[PDB]
Amino acid sequence: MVKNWLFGKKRKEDADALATLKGQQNRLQAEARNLERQSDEQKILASKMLKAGNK
Amino acid sequence: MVKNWLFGKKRKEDADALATLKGQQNRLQAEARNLERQSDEQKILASKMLKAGNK
Amino acid sequence: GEKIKTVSPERTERVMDSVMEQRDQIEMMTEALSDPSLSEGILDFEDDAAIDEQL
Structure with a gap:
């Protein structure tokens, strides 16, 4: 079970950006x-x- | 009963590539x-x- | 202000992205060399019944 550390990190960043845009x-x-x-x-x-x- | 080690290895690799393409x-x-x-x-x-x- | 100019948050995020990417690469290399299907699974034959009989 390989962990994709960078993938998950960038996934969290993109999710936060989408949350900010949706809130605005x-x-x-x-x-x-x-x-x-x-x-x-x-x-x-x-x-x-x-x-x-x-x- | 000969084991084809390289054949099975490449079979697993091709199966993973096909799984990735099918998922996308x-x-x-x-x-x-x-x-x-x-x-x-x-x-x-x-x-x-x-x-x-x-x- | 001088200290924060020297080490910005952008440099911090770049450093942590590099750390996560290198962790991913090291995990790939370590998983390549420790796969049991290379050595441990010599006989994949269906003697599970036969070793049951030996037990």
Whole structure:
């Protein structure tokens, strides 16, 4: 049963890099969802400004 | 009963090389199946974008 | 700061990668010379029944 020491070391390094990239991507997706929510609220506000008589 | 020592040694080496090639081929087939699945999902999404009114 | 410039973390990771690679190579060489199938398994014949009978 040969141990591949360098292979396992580089495997851990690549796994950590992938974890970092996935975490930052998840943060960006959450930020995108929040920005979409804010855009929807702004559209609702624009509709109310239109109805109230404030162009 | 003659032992063919070199023959058996090279037989083990060739069997290990064939196992390595077969394993990498199986990995590539799995990756191909996953890529096909992703392509099908993208086509379904394209159909929904067409129906929704977003060319 | 001068000490860390002399021995950076990059040099440390390079040194440890070299250590692991040389460990792999030494294990390959040591496994080549200690394989029982070269010497210990002289007779692979099915006298397991025969040595059972001798027992």
